[PDB]
């Protein structure tokens, strides 16, 4: 039975936003106090120049970091990394002593070990996005592990792929 | 590990495909209604309620979106690969192979059987390299809770495993 959504109702809006499935990333930065934040707003944008974007809430600490720093990293989380996804979504101590990570050579940001891919990006534009800021980054380098497959987030829940039937 | 040269578009597409997404069909109305398959759909903001899509500068839909006040997004359900392929084909009624309903608010075709329809007003146009980023405000939406979206990952259509919980 179809549910009509009142866009002013944020409970309902979050329900419909949840209808579009995504992967899950952890965005990280270096600097004097490196930080990570779980993000599903990651979107690949352009091939030439190679661009991606993320949308970050204005009240997140990560927002203040990204506005101040020239680069960030994206770690696309693999199917078995729900613990890492939850950890970097916690609002609440080294944030990174729970997880295995390797230093990003271009971003100076911790890259999450076990990820499907790492992308290190230079911040190119900041665009207004309502209660978020849209950060457009140019991909400086990336590394991927072809054997790995991403975790999923849909309907407000973490989910898994069915193995490819072809 | 595979090191990716970002200037190599084959490699770059491989890494872009490592982030799984759903699949939408973006539609517009007007004299010549049009649809295009898009996975760059992203929900952005709660207040105001905003979403974005990234559309190639050379796409025919690109000119529509820069000109028209509204568009619709149909989030495709798990069994809708045929519609995804159809609205991604480059080469004429585009809507004679799908079940669709006119959206009252957008004036654009809404794809039947979808997980959700979102009808949006174009809010901003932002530079996005070889794409334009279209930011839209959600005017109304309808959803079907029992449905689940189709998935696109590694350049292939995929489906969910049953929720363990
Ligand atoms: C699966 C998931 C995806 C998320 N995606 C985003 C996102 O794209 N942008 C964002 O600003 N916050 C996102 N968050 C929220 C963020 O990870 C934190 O949970 C939240 O921001 C609370 O702490 P913080 O603001 O200090 O960071 C996401 C959370 C989860 C669980
Ligand atoms: C699964 C999938 C997702 C796509 N996502 C986008 C997208 O987000 N933006 C885009 O400009 N094109 C996207 N395309 C391509 C688009 O649907 C057409 O295949 C292509 O752009 C050729 O016609 P035209 O849109 O350029 O006109 C996608 C295609 C597929 C198959
Ligand atoms: O598990 P959960 O239900 O506790 O979600 C945790 C937090 O993540 C936030 N969140 C998820 N996606 C977000 C986004 N795109 N932008 C800002 N916050 C987001 C939610 O608001 C929630 O507060
Ligand atoms: O419910 P939820 O946190 O379980 O997630 C449902 C959907 O709402 C989105 N969401 C949650 N909080 C958000 C926020 N503050 N801003 C934008 N999107 C948000 C999530 O990303 C997800 O797409
Ligand atoms: O199946 P497919 O291999 O036939 O892909 C079809 C087309 O979709 C295009 N495509 C996929 N995602 C895109 C995006 N975000 N922007 C522009 N084109 C995209 C590809 O370039 C390809 O030409
Ligand atoms: O290989 P592919 O078409 O099978 O898809 C792989 C990845 O590349 C992306 N992609 C393909 N063509 C693109 C384009 N022209 N611009 C941005 N992203 C594109 C797809 O969306 C997908 O994320
Ligand atoms: Ca209400
Ligand atoms: Ca090459
Ligand atoms: Ca559902
Ligand atoms: Cl809220
Ligand atoms: Cl290409
Ligand atoms: Mg996205």
UniProtKB/Swiss-Prot annotation, chain A:
Name of the gene: sgcE6
SMART domains linked to this entry: Flavin_Reduct
Gene Ontology biological process terms, A to Z: antibiotic biosynthetic process
Molecular function terms from GO: FMN binding; riboflavin reductase (NADPH) activity
Regulation: The SgcE6-SgcC hydroxylation activity decreases in the presence of excess FAD.
Function: SgcE6 provides the FADH(2) required by both the halogenase SgcC3 and the monooxygenase SgcC through free diffusion. Accepts only NADH and FAD as substrates.
Protein name from the UniProt record: NADH-dependent FAD reductase
InterPro entries, A to Z: Flavin_Rdtase-like_dom, NADH-dep_flavin_reductase, Split_barrel_FMN-bd
Source domain of life: Bacteria
Subunit annotation: Homodimer.
Organism: Streptomyces globisporus
